[PDB]
Structure formats: C-alpha cells, structure tokens
Amino acid sequence: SFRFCLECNNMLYPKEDKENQRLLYSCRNCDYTELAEDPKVYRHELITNIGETAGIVDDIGQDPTLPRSDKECPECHSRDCVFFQSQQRRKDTNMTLFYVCLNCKKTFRDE
Amino acid sequence: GSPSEPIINFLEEWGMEPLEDYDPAQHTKSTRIFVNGVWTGIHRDPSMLVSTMRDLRRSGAISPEVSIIRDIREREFKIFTDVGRVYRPLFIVEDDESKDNKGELRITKEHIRKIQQGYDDDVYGWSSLVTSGVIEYVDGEEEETIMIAMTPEDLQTNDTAKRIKPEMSTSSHHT
Amino acid sequence: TKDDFSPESKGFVENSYLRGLTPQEFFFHAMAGREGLIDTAVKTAETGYIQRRLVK
Amino acid sequence: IKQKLETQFTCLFCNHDNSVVCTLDKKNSIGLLECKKCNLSFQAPINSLSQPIDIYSDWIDACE
Amino acid sequence: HTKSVYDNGETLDISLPIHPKSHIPQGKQDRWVVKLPDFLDINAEPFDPRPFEMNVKTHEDKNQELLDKLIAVNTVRWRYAKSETGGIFKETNSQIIQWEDGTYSLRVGSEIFDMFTTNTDDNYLVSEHNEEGILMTESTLSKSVKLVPASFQSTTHQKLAKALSAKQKKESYARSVVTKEDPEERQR
Amino acid sequence: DDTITTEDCWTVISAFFEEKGLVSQQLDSFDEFMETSIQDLVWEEPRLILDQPAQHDNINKRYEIRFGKIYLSRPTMTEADGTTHAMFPQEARLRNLTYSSPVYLDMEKSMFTSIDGNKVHIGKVPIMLRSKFCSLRTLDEVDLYKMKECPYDMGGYFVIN
Amino acid sequence: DTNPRSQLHSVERTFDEVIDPRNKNRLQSLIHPRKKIKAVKAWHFFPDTSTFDQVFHSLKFVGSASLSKDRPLNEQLGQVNASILTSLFKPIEINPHNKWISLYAVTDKLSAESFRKSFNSIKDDNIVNRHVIYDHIKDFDQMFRGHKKLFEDFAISFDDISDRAFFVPIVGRLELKKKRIVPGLVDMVNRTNYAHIRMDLRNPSTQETAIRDSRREQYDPVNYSSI
Amino acid sequence: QSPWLLRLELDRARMLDKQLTMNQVADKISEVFSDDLFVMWSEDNADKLIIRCRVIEEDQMLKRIEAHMLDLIALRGIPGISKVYMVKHKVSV
Amino acid sequence: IKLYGREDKGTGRTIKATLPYVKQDIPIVIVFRALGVVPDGEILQHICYDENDWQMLEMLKPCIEEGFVIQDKEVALDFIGRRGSAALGIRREKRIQYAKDILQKELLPHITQEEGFETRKTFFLGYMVNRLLLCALERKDQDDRDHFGKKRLDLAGPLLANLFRILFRKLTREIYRYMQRCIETDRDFNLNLAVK
Ligand SMILES: [Zn+2]
Ligand SMILES: [Zn+2]
Ligand SMILES: [Zn+2]
C-alpha cells in the first residue's frame, strides 16, 4: 500500500536523508514530507495466491446456476451450502472447492 | 429495437443513483448499472431492482424483447434494447420460495384450453401467453444466468431399448 | 450447473445410435461432426499446395 | 545525443517552405530549430516526451 | 510548510441584511436533499379550487392526459383552512411517516412512497446573494434521499407502467398518399 | 391443476406459428424501416444552408431549405403512353418490372436576409412482398387466386426487373 | 376520471384524509402495504415562507477538495464546527476562461460560536453589531449545472415541537475541485482576493424588506400583500 | 555502502527439489558481481530460507539490479534446455 | 487502450490510449488530466475500486511516473492538440479548442455529446482501464470472440437504412451543387429540378 499527499493528493515517493539517516515519504510536487512508519519500500511476489479467494460477493447465494451441497458449516452448522472452484483462471490453478453458507455467507474449505 | 428512455425512467424511479453522486470508496458493494452498454448509475439493492424489472417485462410494461441481465460475480446489471439480438422463447418456472407453486410451470391446462378456444373467459393467442407471464424471451447473453429444465418431466425428481437420461447428481437439489 | 466435470456434462454419449441420443448429446455430437468437416475442408488446400511444390 | 531531422515547416521570416531542420539534444534537454535559408536559430527546452511538433509549436508561440 | 499566499491584510467593510426565520432547527443543522421523481410535483402556491377546475386540459393523446392526471392528483399542495374558532390555519395534504425500523416515508393522500437515505460527506446548503456576489452558507446536507414507490399494487406505479408501456406502442411517422399520375411529370 | 403433456407443448408451438409464421423477421424489419427509418434518416440532416454576404450596401443573405414529412404510396406502373395503374407482383414478374413505390418529401424554402414548397418525388423504393405496404397484404384468399398468386407463398422478398 | 369535477373531488378527498399526528390511534391504524409495519411518528409537510425570497444552491466538493480528507485544513478549522457552518464563499471571475471561488472562515472558536448563536436566534428586531473578521483559507475551481424545473431538488428540515417539516427550493448544484495556482500568475492572484473580510450585522433596510416581501407575495399573499 | 537493503525469500521445497545449496547460489552471485555487492545468506536450518544483499537516489538502481538478478542468474544446467524427462527405451541386443 | 511492454521486458509497463484524429498514442494519465481531473489519487480512485489490491496499483505506477511531467489541464489539452492531425501552424488557443472539440465529440460518442458532461466519460475510462488490468493480471479470461450473445444480425431494415443514408447524402450534395450553380443566375428555382 502507498500513501497520498495530504495537501495536493499526489503520490508520496520515499526519500532518504543523508544527514539524518531516515526514510521519509515526500511529494515531488511540493515541500510536504511525512515520516515513514515501516522500511518495506517494495515487495514483489513471483508466485502469488491473491485473487484466489478474493473473488467473493455477498449475494452469491442468489445465483440459481450454482450447485448446492450439504456440507457442514464450521460456524453456524447449517445443512445447506453453495460451492464453486477457484476464481483465478491461470493454468497452474488448483481444483479445490470453496463453500459458502446460506446464513453466515463465509468462505471455507474442506481440508 | 426499443427506446431506452422508459427503461431509464423506471430505473431512476426505483432508487438508482447517478454517476455524479458516486464515490468508489463509499460504494464498495454497489452494483454498476449499464443500459445499452452505457454506464448510467449505481444501485445498492440489485435483487429488488431485477425482480421489479423482470415482473414489469413479464406483464407487458416493458417490451418482451428487452434483455435483463444480472452478473452477480462481477456486480453488474446490464440492460439491452438494441436491434439485432437473436432470442427464443421458454416456459417460466415459478421460482418464488414464498409461493406454494414453487418448482412448477406457470402454464396450466386452463391456458391450453383458452388457446384451443381462441378467446379468454372474461383473441387469445401467443402474445396473450407472453404478456401473461407464462412465457418469455431470452437471448444468448441472458441465457448465461438462467437454469433450464430440458423437459417438464425434469421438474419432478432397466429397459434395453429406451434411451438413458443424465442423473445430474452433482447438486443435492435443483431450482 | 456451474463447475460440472461429470462425463455427461462435458460430452460423453452413453447411448447408442439404436437407443437414441438425448438433446445434449445430440448437440455435442453435432459439434464434433462440424469439427470433422471444417478440418477436412481446411487441410485440403495446404495438402494440394505441398503436393504441387513437391512435383515441381 | 543530438538528433537532426528534416521538417516540412514554414519559416516566418523568409517564407520559404521545406527549409526547417529540428535539432534536439535529449541529454541537455534542448531543441534547436534552424532555417536553411534565414540561418536563424530558435532554442527552447524539451522534455522526455518531446517531439519536433512540440518545438515547432513553441516557436510559433514565441513568434507571436 | 506551504506559506500563506495572502498577507496584504486589506479588508472590506461589507454589511449583509438578514431577515428573521419562521423556524429554527433544533439540536442539529441537518437537512435531507430529496430528488423529485417524475410522478411527483411540488405546488408551493395555495390550492385554489375554482382556477384548478377551470384550467384542466384535455388532450387527444391518452398517455399524456393520464400522466397529467397522475401528477396532478399526486402533486403536493397546501391550502388555508378556516378554523372553527374563526382563525386561519395552514393545511397540507402531505405527511411524513416513520416506521418501527427507523425508515421514513412520504405520504400524499393514500399513496405512500418509501425513502432511501445515502450518507453524503462535505455537502452543504448555501444562500446566494447576487446583489453582493457572495454565497452565504445555511446548513449541512448530510443525507441524500431518493423516493421509491412502496409496492406494485400502488395506483401510481400501475399508472406509470401503463403510460410508459402505451407511450412506446404508438409509432407511425410516414403518412400514406395516393398517386394519380406519373411522379416525374412535375420534373419534365 | 393438471399436468402439462407434450401435446400441450405442441399446441403452444402451433399458437406460435399461427401468430408469427416463418418469415416474420423479414416483414417486421422492412415494416420498421418503411414506417420510421426513412423519416429519421431524412431528419438526421434536416437543414441545407447557403449564405452569401453580397456587397455589390452590405446585405447578408442566408438561403436555407428544410425537409418535412415523408409520404409513401402503393406501387404504381407508368406506361409509355402516359397512363398509370396499380401494379401487382405477378405483372411485375411477367413483364420484368420492378415492384417499387414512389417516395415524396416536403421541402420548405425560406429566404433569410439581414442588413449589417410541396411534395417532391425523391425516388422509388422497392417493396417487400406481403409486408404492410404490399398490395397482397389485404387481399383475401379468393382475390389472391384471381391475382394468380399462390396462397402458400409467404413473401419476404423483392421483385427487381 | 377525465372529468375536472372528478379530479377536484379527488383533490378534496386527499385533502380531507390527512391523519392528525397527535392522534396516536389513527397513526397506529395506518399500516405499510408491503412491510406490514405500524407507524410510530408523523410530521406535517409544509413549505417555508421566510426563505422563498432567497436563492439556495446545493454546494458540494468533488474529489480531493473534501474537508475531511484535508487533515491539516480540518485541524486548523477544528475537528459540527461553527466555522464550517458559518463560512463565506466569494465568487470572483477575472474573465470567462479563468474562474475560482474564495473561501473564508472564522479561525476563533468563540467568535464563530457567538456569530452562529446570534444568527440562529434571529426572531426579534434587535441585532447586535457583531464585527466578525473572516480569514481566507483556500481556493477551488468551480462548475455549475442549472435545473430546468424550479423544484427539481428540495432540502427537508424538521421541527419536532410543531410536528412539521419545512422544505426549501434548490436552484442549482455547484461542484468544487482543488485548484493548483500557476506560479507565473501569483502576482495577479495577490491582487484579486483579500487576506481578511469584516462582516457587520445590521438591521435590514425598509426598502429591501419591502422588496423581499413583494417577492414572497407570489407564495403567500394573505399575510404579506402590500396595502 | 548504501542504507538500502535487498533481501529475497526463496521457496525451500523447490530449492531442495532441484538439489541446490545456498553457498552455491552465493558463489554464483559473488562471481557475476565481484565485490560490487556484499552478500549474506541464512543457513540451512532457518525457518525461512533467505539471502540478503547490500550495495557498496539509488532505489531505482537497486530495483534494476534486482530485476537483472531475477532475470539472468544461471545456477546450473545447459542454457536452452527448458525441461528434461526420463524415458525408458526398449532395445533389442 | 493498448498495454505496451512485455512481461519482464521493455522496462515499465505503460498504458497508452489511442484516440480518434490523433497521430500517436497517448498515456492514460495525460488524457485523464485533459478531461479535467488532475490529482493522481483521484485518477486511481476512478480506475481502481478496492485500495487493498496492491498489484493493480503497482501496474499503474509506471503510467503515473510517465505522466508526472504533465501537471495541468491546459498543457494536457495542448499536448492533445499538437498531435491532432490538423493543419500545421495552428495557434495554441485554437489547438486547445480543437482538443476540446475532439475530446467532447468523437471520444465515446455513445455516452454523451454535450459540454460539461465528461464525468461519465472519466468513469467509463476508469472502467475500461479496470477491465484491461483485470484481464492482464490473469484474473479473468479474455473475451470470447465467438460468443453468440455478443453478435448482432442485420435484416432488411438496417441494410436498407444504411444504403438509403448514403444515397440521400449523395442526393443532398447534388441539390447543394445545383443550388450553388443556380444562385449565379439568381433565379427563383422551382426546387423540383434540383432533386434527382
Ligand atoms: Zn504534495
Ligand atoms: Zn454458516
Ligand atoms: Zn527563413
């Protein structure tokens, strides 16, 4: 996550002080400068799993084309649920199922 | 082809909010509303809206060849009144849970008898069936969101010469 | 329904020609036959061109 | 690196056409327009996305 | 540190005339902005039965006449009611109904229209002073309110559906004619 | 109620084919065209404008013409001797004629000047057979036989030459 | 029901069936057609007499111009603040191409509170001379959209003691976005606006009051027509 | 040297599957980069296998160095041979 | 709206947008500013709809870096106006007016045609860029070209309408030419002769 300038809404690029030895987020369109909280400047994931379970909506139980199972819900122990596979559509994607209860509407696995 | 102005009037009447009053941070769960490919607004209760639009179309208030599509996965609600869309008719199954007729065809023997006679018991043809809500048209894009029984015998749950029908056991129940 | 990997959902015809196909099996079989016709009517020109170059 | 390109622009002093050459140096962020007949030189700063049309428009604005 | 641009200190001695208000909000300077639907109209003028009867317009187009009838019967109005004690009181035909869930509904006669409230930030109401060319703020518009028909069986919804369905049914621009001679006769 | 048999489905399909027929899309599209599309195309660019700042006492003159209503007729045949009569598709087939109808447009001319019009025939449009603008739409079964038209013929085509 | 007599009779029928808000029994008698939920409280819907002469516009900030988002600006003006509720807007236009809005506010909390209390309590004919000084804060770019119909939008204010609800017309909507001043035009910018503006509260003149009453005579002629 | 730090987390399972040693990767980086980059590597027993680096406005320079390192560091094998399979051949002798 | 740059090649993955009557592609940030929304944060607000998705923000970062050179609406419109394929030598104000014309009209005409209605155009541009990013990040499959619900059939009506539009424009041009020729003679033409 990256922060924005509080006065002109531009991006806050990180900057390093030679004399003070501190990491600071500074806007290049002004003189505003705010002290950085964490040193994690950049992170790149070669193999990522985000978007696998992130594709979830709160009204997925109203879809009539989705199959319905009788798996046990971990939270409220309901007897009706709706399952589907991974929303990510790469070639390496697993065939595991995500179950959605019809009362608490949370996503849970079978393992 | 049909004009899109009554569609916009109906949508604005039933709580659709325009784009100028839309904030993506605030509306992290609203549904985008498209009309003929034009993003015209947003809504936060798409279920009531799609139910109202479908009921209006089935009653003849909206033209029967208008497409009403709800993409739940992408949080979109699309409407098409364009010219050139290929459609076909289908029977309507009563899907209301609160109704007693759930899981059954809306068309009855009374409709068949009226069609055979040719008039209503206070001309009764195909259009009368379409505007009575027992038949409706669907195009290829709206077909992606519906669940179709092949025969009316499929709505209710060892011979070497008769063909074998699919079990469809992957789902515990079918609506 | 969505995410169905059963044999009947993805084009397995369990009936014979004597018994008769169901509409889903009929449509899948028509798709396969269309594939066959397209493949023949498309590869004929490439084969003819290869034969002409070989002869010349 | 200086880049020299022949352009079809019209000089506003000599009125001869197809006698305008654009010379832009991306290293020093400068652009030079020289007239092959008038021998006049116009200098204007250039950016990373600069094109000869940018320097030509800058010359037009400077001329008026 | 963005230094303040303006430091001249020049000041205008402008005085604004202000009038007393008939009402004052209590506890919160909040107002709700409501979009006006097509089936609802506002008649700030007092209801005058004789001019209203004398100004009813009849059109050949049934849809336009039905729309005018619906908006006229649904129009928010008010009139002076003579009290039994001899005084005069303002009487209106519109009310606001709040249910047990906390939602609000606008009622005109027997028709009830639900209200959908959406919270809005940094939205205020101002008063324009054109003669001085400045805008004076009034209060804060916290919520935006949309008006929705209560149910299908409401007469307003049925009339709107009928009008919109029969409006697009009438479509005939080209007018037929009979040719008695060769068209090219005028040209030659 | 009672269950719905396959015969009921075939009754519904018979109702469909009784109402629509097999060439309904062609006729409906052509009827939509003739009814509204020609008028809309004419009104797309309804104003031609010519200006002339005459100085030969400066008089700025604008000349402009407006397009009005579209008028259509039933197809007619004009003979060499000058007479006219109603045309029918069998005659057009036999004599290698074109089954088409004249189109008339109202042009209004105005003469604007600042110091500082009836039906014109614009062409003939071929008529699709058995459509709303065809002569065979009204004819019943007997006059259809008298006109040498087959009652099994469905229309949906044009007769050019 | 195309008869004008029928329409008039329907109008009087709608007028007569108004439920008294104090009548709790009749209020509980009313039932939601769909929700099937009884009514709790009621309010009369009335127009406002004292505000029809003035012109009201719905003013909104678009995007980054939000006061909540601008944390130093919000901290300077107070974390509802009376300074925000008593702010002044001054539209100045050098030319048709260049336009902006000037915003002023009261930095002091006590002065803003006193001014707001004095302004919200105007029901008599005695107004104290509150020489309040307004300080410039920020400038924004503006666009305006006009309403074809008069009462396209209306804001509703409530009054619990009288069980009424007063609505006011909205003429247009004003949208504001943050404007970055060009460094080459600061010399002309400094000559346009002012660092301070002093507001003096005075009783309205008789002629202006008569003009405003004449404007209000369109709505209410019983209590405001000139004699 | 520079305050900027570059550490990359490597998957233990696939690193063991390819039968590779952390010291080997460290020597490869040292050879391709000489003394321009100081390198340290966590031992085998670490919960997460990591290997850091330090250079001896340079954030973009470090980003380009990281991209170049990810792109063209060859640990072992013949270049061009993307995958290798084992096959059994029936031969008559 | 093309997405230049191959995976792990070509340095940054810039997003350039092709515009009608414009000779060279344009980065999305510059045209976004030209429509009238300068701050980069609001550009990201229009494009993305969920701040926690750092991957799409990372993919938009090169576009922000490239577009940082332009920071004002008017210079953005001018940059649009230089490449607008018009006659060489047009003045700056006329270039800006030409950019305003080519931006209001012919850029997504199906949305709107009037002035001051570009908010919907900005939202639709954000929607298109969001769809492009969603497909680029392997979150969705590319659209099925052979899907039949995305096709249309033209019957006798539309075909005859297109043909009649072309022929009527030809007839109108002939009427215009005859009128221009006739005004030389200065006669009260019957107007039944201009029409062919
Ligand atoms: Zn900044
Ligand atoms: Zn549950
Ligand atoms: Zn020269």
Closest chain E residue by Cα to residue B64 = E165
Distance of CA G172 to the CA centre of its chain: 12
Nearest to B171 among C1, C22, C23 (CB): C1
The rounded distance, in Å, linking the Cα atoms of G211 and G224 is 11
Residue A103 marked ligand-binding = yes
Whether residues A12 and A34 share a domain: the answer is yes
User: Which residues, in sequence order, are bridge partners of residue B59?
Assistant: none
Lookup: tokens for F148: 């040498």
Give residue A36's domain range: 1-44
Closest-CA distance, A48 to chain H, in angstroms, reads: 12
Cα G42 to Cα G23: distance, rounded to the nearest angstrom: 10
E45 three-state secondary structure: strand
Tell whether A30 is within 8 A of chain G (Cβ). Answer: no
C22 contact residues in B (CB cutoff 8 A):
150, 163-166
Portion 7-46 of C in contact with B at CB < 8 A? 8-9, 14-15, 19-24
Residues A105 and A66 in one domain: yes
Say if the Cβ atoms of H63 and A47 lie within 8 Å: no
Q: Three-state secondary structure along E59-77? A: CCCHHHHHHHHHHHHHCEE
Domains of chain I as residue ranges with CATH: 1-152 (3.90.1110.10)
Chains that touch H (3 or more CB pairs under 8 A): A, I
Q: Are residues A49 and A101 in the same domain?
A: yes
- Tell me the C-alpha distance between E130 and G194, whole Å: 20
Interface partners of chain A (CB pairs < 8 Å, 3 or more) are B, C, E, G, H, I
Between CA G165 and CA E49 the distance in angstroms is 24
Structural method: cryo-EM
| Chain F residues inside the 8 Å CB shell of E173 | 35-36, 39-40, 69-70
Long-range CB contacts (within 8 A, 24+) of G201-209 = G201/E15, G201/E16, G201/E18, G201/G118, G201/G127, G201/G128, G201/G129, G201/G130, G201/G132, G202/E15, G202/E17, G202/G127, G202/G129, G203/E17, G203/G125, G203/G127, G204/E17, G204/E18, G204/E19, G205/E17, G208/E17, G209/E19
Beta bridge partners of H38: H54
The two structure tokens encoding residue B170: 């992957």
Annotated binding residue D38: yes
Distance (Å, whole) CA G57 – CA G171? 5
Do A83 and A93 have their domain in common?
Answer: yes
- Shared domain check, A61 and A39: no
Q: For residues D53 and I88, what is the distance between their CA atoms, to the nearest angstrom?
A: 9
**φ, ψ at G106 (rounded to 5°):** -100, 115
- With 0-12 / 13-18 / 19 or more C-beta atoms within 10 angstroms meaning exposed / middle / buried, residue E79 is middle
Residues of chain G with Cβ-Cβ distance to A6 below 8 Å are: 69-72
Q: Shortest Cα distance from B1 to chain C (angstroms)?
A: 30
DSSP F154: -
Residues A69 and A97 in one domain: yes
- CA of E185 to nearest chain G CA: how many angstroms apart? 50
Amino acid identity, residue H2? S
The answer to whether B95 contacts A70, with C-beta atoms less than 8 Å apart, is no
Mutation target vs D (from I11, I79, I98; most D CBs, 10 A cutoff): I79
Residues of chain F positioned with their CB less than 8 A from the CB of E176: 71-73
Inter-chain contacts counted by CB atoms under 8 A, chains E and F = 49
Query: What is the longest distance spanned by two Cα atoms in chain H?
Result: 69
CA distance I6 to chain D (A): 21
Domains of chain D and CATH, by start: 1-64 (2.20.25.190)
Residue appearing with tokens 């009238």: I36
Domain CATH number, residue A58 = 2.20.25.10
Angle at E72 between CA E66 and CA E78, to 5 degrees: 170
**The residue type at B173:** H
Q: What are phi and psi of D32, to 5 degrees?
A: -115, 125
A84 and A98, same domain (yes or no): yes
Are A4 and A27 in a shared domain? yes
Tokens of A48: 């990522």
CB contact under 8 A, E178 and F84: no
Q: Are D37 and D18 in contact (CB under 8 A)?
A: no
A25 and A39 co-located in one domain:
yes
Residue-wise burial string across G130-143, b where 16 or more C-beta atoms lie within 10 A, e elsewhere: eebebbbbbbbbbe
**Which residues on A lie below 8 Å from I141 (Cβ)?**
89
Residues of H in contact with A2 (CB under 8 A): none
- Where on the phi/psi map is residue A21: left (φ > 0), alpha (ψ -120 to 50), or beta? left
Q: How far is CA G92 from CA B18, E41, G140, in A?
A: 30, 35, 11
Cα(B74)–Cα(G87) distance, integer angstroms: 43
End-to-end CA distance of chain E: 86
For chain I, say whether F57 makes contact (Cβ under 8 Å). no
| CB < 8 Å to G69, chain A | 6, 9
* Whether residues A103 and A54 fall in one domain: yes
DSSP string, D30-54: EEEEEETTT--EEEEE--TT--HHH
How many CB pairs lie under 8 A apart between chains A and H?
A: 11
Three-state SS at E168: coil
> Would you say A73 is a known binding-site residue?
yes
Torsion on CA atoms G137, G142, G146, G152, rounded to nearest 10: -50
CB E126 within 8 A of CB G59: yes
Total domains in chain A come to 2
Whether I70 contacts I30, CB under 8 Å = yes
Residues 6+ apart with CB under 8 A from B70: B46, B50, B76, B77, B78, B145
CB-CB under 8 Å, G70 with A7:
yes
Same domain, A71 and A94: yes
Domain boundary among A44, A59, A77: A44
DSSP G223: T
Residue B150 is given by DSSP the state S
Pair (A38, A81) in one structural domain: no
Q: Which ligand is nearest the CA of A75, by number?
A: 2
- For residues B102 and I163, give the distance between their C-alpha atoms in angstroms, rounded to a whole number: 51
- How buried is B127 (Cβ within 10 angstroms: 0-12 exposed, 13-18 middle, 19+ buried)? middle
Pick the closest to residue H37 from H77, H65, H73 (CA basis): H65
Q: Report the C-alpha gap between E59 and B168 in whole angstroms.
A: 59
The Cα–Cα gap between G123 and G140 comes to: 35
